[PDB]
Design a protein around this ligand. Sequence first.
Ligand SMILES: Cc1cccc(N)c1N
Length: 150
Amino acid sequence: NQIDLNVTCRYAGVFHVEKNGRYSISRTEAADLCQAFNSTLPTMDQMKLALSKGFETCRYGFIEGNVVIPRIHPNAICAANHTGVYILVTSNTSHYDTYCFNASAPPEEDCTSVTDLPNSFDGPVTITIVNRDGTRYSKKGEYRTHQEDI
Ligand SMILES: Cc1cccc(N)c1N
């Protein structure tokens, strides 16, 4: 009973989380996941400031109200070569990654490891935070509050 959470550097507090390295987070699970990181889903204004500080990914993820990919460099296989905060308009499907915003993060780029899920609650799941440099932090707990997500 295990969940891996792949996390990025923070840029102005905003980071990206992938569950088990595949698109697999529902909108409800996204909110619970950010809450476990003592974070919230970013607003579009928070995401645009993060973008300005160097944040980009090649993955769709929830923010408050939309699913987006932040892009700095045009790449043909990421967001159809767009730059800026690219907003997903048309999809059949409901599961993506998530973005999260932690107000206590440094103001610009923070590429130190993420070390904890401070607001996870008691539970049976081994949850592992996986940083891009491979550093891992694990704890037993739970973060999902909706049955439909378990
Ligand atoms: C694939 C992957 C593994 C660990 C951390 C991150 N950010 C990513 N994208």
